[PDB]
Amino acid sequence: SSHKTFRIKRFLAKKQKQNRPIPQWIRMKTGNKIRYNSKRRHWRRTKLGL
Amino acid sequence: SEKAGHQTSAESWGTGRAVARIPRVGGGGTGRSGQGAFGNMCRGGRMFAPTKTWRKWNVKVNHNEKRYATASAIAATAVASLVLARGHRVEKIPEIPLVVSTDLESIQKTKEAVAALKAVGAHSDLLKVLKSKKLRAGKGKYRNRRWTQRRGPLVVYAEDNGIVKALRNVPGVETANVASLNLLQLAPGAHLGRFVIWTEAAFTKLD
Amino acid sequence: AKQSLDVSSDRRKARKAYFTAPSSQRRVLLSAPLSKELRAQYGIKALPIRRDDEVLVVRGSKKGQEGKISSVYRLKFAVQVDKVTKEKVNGASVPINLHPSKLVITKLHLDKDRKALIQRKGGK
Amino acid sequence: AISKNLPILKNHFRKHWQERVKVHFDQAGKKVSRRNARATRAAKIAPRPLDLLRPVVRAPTVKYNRKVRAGRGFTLAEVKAAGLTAAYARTIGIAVDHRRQNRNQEIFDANVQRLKEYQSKIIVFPRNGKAPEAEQVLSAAATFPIAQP
RNA sequence: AAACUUUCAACAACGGAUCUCUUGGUUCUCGCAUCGAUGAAGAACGCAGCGAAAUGCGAUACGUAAUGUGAAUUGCAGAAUUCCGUGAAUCAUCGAAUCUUUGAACGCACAUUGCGCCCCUUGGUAUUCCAGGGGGCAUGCCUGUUUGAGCGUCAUU
RNA sequence: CUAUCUAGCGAAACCACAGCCAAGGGAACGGGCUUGGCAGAAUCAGCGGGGAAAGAAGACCCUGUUGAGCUUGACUCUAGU
RNA sequence: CGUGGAGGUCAGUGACGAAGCCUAGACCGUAAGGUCGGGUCGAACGGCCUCUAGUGCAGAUCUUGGUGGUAGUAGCAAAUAUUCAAAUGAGAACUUUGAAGACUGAAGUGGGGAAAGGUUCCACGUCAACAGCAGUUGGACGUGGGUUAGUCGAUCCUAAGA
RNA sequence: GUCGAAUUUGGGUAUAGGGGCGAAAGACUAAUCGAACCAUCUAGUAGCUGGUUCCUGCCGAAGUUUCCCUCAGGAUAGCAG
RNA sequence: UUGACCUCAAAUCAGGUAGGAGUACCCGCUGAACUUAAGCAUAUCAAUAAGCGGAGGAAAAGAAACCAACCGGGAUUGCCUUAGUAACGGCGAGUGAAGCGGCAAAAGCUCAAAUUUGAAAUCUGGUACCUUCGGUGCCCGAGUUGUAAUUUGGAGAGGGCAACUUUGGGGCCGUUCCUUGUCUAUGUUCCUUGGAACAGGACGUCAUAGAGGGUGAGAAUCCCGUGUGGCGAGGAGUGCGGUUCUUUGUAAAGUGCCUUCGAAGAGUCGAGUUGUUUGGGAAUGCAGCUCUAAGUGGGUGGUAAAUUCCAUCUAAAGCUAAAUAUUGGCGAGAGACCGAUAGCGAACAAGUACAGUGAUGGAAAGAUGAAAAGAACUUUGAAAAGAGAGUGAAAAAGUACGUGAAAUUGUUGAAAGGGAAGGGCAUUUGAUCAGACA
């Protein structure tokens, strides 16, 4: 809701920044097996549960 | 591991739900939920009769009966037919048993040790070991057992003045003190007729 | 044969130590033998590979070609020669990775540290 | 669970016995450790014989009283009869047991003789620190064996 | 007679068995004895030229200092003077430092980034009001210091 | 408004193998066995006779030296008093 | 008879192709099985004498995974309702604009909030997947922007209670 | 059916598993109640149901006796190798 | 009034200390039931799981109020044995030690109770200085309601007499121990196959080095290492092997004979009773309550009691290495172990994704090639892509990637089909195929 504590807002801020695709240049590194971000989140599919 | 296959809180669903009565993982939301557990027929379960460390490994053998086998093995080394039938290249060896001079016990270098062995007729047996090196034929290759080869001559001495070090690097050749002869070396694979080269001092000490 | 209790013959341990070796230890692993002319001149058998070293290829499809070491790619366990490259279909050129054990050093880049290493190994 | 002509068995395995199974896989390893410990102690301690001299005593009980064996230590009366004090005896490699008493003259005489022979076959180095090097004998028991009278 | 149905073969699908591979697991043996109020284990939030995670680190933030090795790092860009040298490095070693908010957690509180007190100092025409910077204030117990209480009690006025 | 036909989209129950009858004998009520009646591709909309149709290791009843809830001067105990 | 591993031996087979797999092609054995040719394939593997076992599957409403018939079938029918033209686009019953016909009918399908959610808000770009038809559209995908308080709340007070 | 009250309801707070709560139905206590949910003891026991993996060769049964809280089970003798 | 003493407080007083984590092994407390007895209550499971308190590298135990009955042994712990024995037990099911004997390891000790009394001789702290894990001087304080020296039962102490014997505390350099560094052999010589030689053939070399790994396929001799030795660097502990500076000290200890003495632990031992526990049985240990000692005494001597002897130790206070334990932590070496549905749940950004209000529950998922050389360019299409071309040893390796089985499916070819299909014996027809031409 609009009324939120500082702890909740700080928690929400980190979850927003962690929700992004992997940079392309990382896949070109030597010995790289990572293709897609397996920890991607959508607000309607999986809830944070704070 | 004693805990393998039992790190689960699975419980049987009972009858009436149209499934087998095997215990099943509780909860939900992972795919592992509802799967069978604890059974020897279940994926990720416990094997039937898990192996234990207190299985018998070593075997007792009567001391006198053990010496009977050792004496039989020593006597078999003096029979040319048995030595030949065990795969040793002793076709043109002059006399079996083969006794060489005591100075063989004082050889310090590998090069001169090999030359002495070749001079008494062991050249063909040494070449057999080199030409028989092969890669193992199963999963033992990556269990630190990667190569196999034949067994060569056995050199028996009375006193060690450098002979053991000189023959250490020669493939297939092993040395043994006359006082502590080993049945595992005299009859490899439980097959009699090992090719044995005796020194003069060791041959006398047999009495 | 092995005679010490501090050394292990385990294949699994040996391979893990090779593939996880740090950069400093890969320098020793990337050593190359000297040529006959240099072996007699200095009196040593092999040295760790160094940039700006003249080498000759003695194995593979690139046997007979020479050049200077332009990059020691420790992360890939390989070195690259300036004039040993491959031409792509689009016209671009890429270096060819070579293992130093398949090369022969024909000229050494010398400085204060390299000379001391040669004398440390009994060379002249 | 009773059938056929068989002996009655008394196998005691109704507890959680599998949790308390001890297999001596390290029998060979412990022998190596003990030999290493004896070797390092002999070098470390002194040219001393690595063990203390023991007296000869009569085994108790009517079943074993026909044999003599090694006791714990010499009595206060035995060491006094040999011409030395208990405190000095401990520092020269003689075990002293204050709670054993002497009632047999034959045992008392035998233990006195052992102490006499021990003092004549050892060299006590001075406290100055010269300490001339001497060969180390590793077993005082082997040097002074016990014989049945 | 076609279509359709069924059986077999070839080629193509579907699916991931089989074979070979292994920086993992498991068991046995040997050696050693080192967490924390000098703030531990754990938690939260941050830190890279281009990074979400893992790994590393703490506003000195994928690191600072020191020692060793002696020329890299590398996906791209960049920096080049760092190359016969107090000196390259996502190197090794590691004895000097930094170490946000927390946590046994210690000014009081905490579903709050809530609310006090003391010392030094700076600014606002200021010992008292407001603000910035630095340093402090938990409990039980032990030894000692100092200040005290009780006709419990002594001696002397 | 469906059903129905077309374009697009597109599951599930269930499934030993399967699917025409009469009598016979048979585990005393056959789709198969025996003897007869018969029997011709591929199919659409309906239909509830049959498939002893599907849904659940019968809640009824009995057995087990298997339980639990409840009651009582059953056996043996116990907090409190 | 066959399978994993172990000691011995055949100085056994092999990148001039080991193992595996396919093959209404051939041969041996009463059988368990063994051998050969052809195709595919790419790095190890077998005979014999012995040792050892986590050693042989059609079933257990067996475990895990994969795949069928059913079947292009059941169905995609509550909430009155859509139509014409232009624009855009490879493509329009469904996007945008205009026109028309309608509904919610102020205890609303209107205009704000508490809890709960957490960037879904806004612009640009874009359609493989998702919106059980469609899609140029979107709460989708990619990249950015955006929440400003001495007076509104929290903070302070006490309630049942802790 | 009821609709100004023994009314309806938000938030705060109290009562926790042989315990709670009950205008009392063994009702309710997070789709769970004639004793919740979670982990462990636990691979709990089962005279009861189901299953139990290669070939060939030779031999080849029993449902009967006695005892048993024995009657879907054992011991014992017999039959078999 | 003043100044002490006793007891009790305060301070953000000076300096310290305790908490939490980990917990495999160790020392205690608390404490079940499933199960077995073919039922079941004593019993059994079990003095176990769970719960709670407390340590270390080990812990605990430990120098006899022991075992014995013998010609006696002699701290503790562990192994072999005693022994499935004595004994316990609805004497049912079941349970169950100890002494001796062999061995591993060995090590002993000190407080209380005495007048220093011709001298509190003892100690914390503060302060100055110094050779700083401490020392000295000085000043307060603690303490006579007892701090040192002296003595602990094996003894020992106060006197008298007569004799010799025996040293203490540091520096330096070596050695030992641990943590590390560096140096120290021999072919890439010819022919064939291959994309690649590390394969095959020929000819050599080293070997106290033919362990292991890497490098374009099976490499002792290409690289790292391996084997044997050499030369360094930094610490720990005084364990000792040498040298060196101090005389500790009218100090301290040991030993003979004579004489007088010889202090030794209380609500404790022991007894009754109740509960629990043990193989311990007229009662093994532990605990509650009641009673409550002795000094030629007291405990024990495995059947209760009275009486008479004997044996053996010395409780009610304390410390102490090694042999023993170890599913935790750190560092190593291994296997007739498993080989991606196996082996730890996890060989991968795994205690991760995800589920539950919560305690908790908990996956799936490894392999292009030697090297991306990851397909320039042309053409069709709105595009995805297709058809060519090209790279490679191989696209029958194209980021849906090694090998690529079965179920199931498409195309092509052959054959049969009047309410199933499949099978056995025999032969016709079609297709297809081995064997001898001696």
Ligand SMILES: [Cl-]
């Ligand atoms: Cl919000």
Ligand SMILES: [Cl-]
């Ligand atoms: Cl086993």
Ligand SMILES: [Cl-]
């Ligand atoms: Cl091979």
Ligand SMILES: [Cl-]
């Ligand atoms: Cl056969």
Ligand SMILES: [Cl-]
């Ligand atoms: Cl609760």
Ligand SMILES: [Cl-]
């Ligand atoms: Cl792991």
Ligand SMILES: [Cl-]
């Ligand atoms: Cl849950």
Ligand SMILES: [Mg+2]
């Ligand atoms: Mg979104």
Ligand SMILES: [Mg+2]
């Ligand atoms: Mg939702």
Ligand SMILES: [Mg+2]
């Ligand atoms: Mg498993």
Ligand SMILES: [Mg+2]
């Ligand atoms: Mg014997």
Ligand SMILES: [Mg+2]
């Ligand atoms: Mg195989």
Ligand SMILES: [Mg+2]
């Ligand atoms: Mg009919």
Ligand SMILES: [Mg+2]
């Ligand atoms: Mg009938």
Ligand SMILES: [Mg+2]
């Ligand atoms: Mg039927």
Ligand SMILES: [Mg+2]
């Ligand atoms: Mg019929």
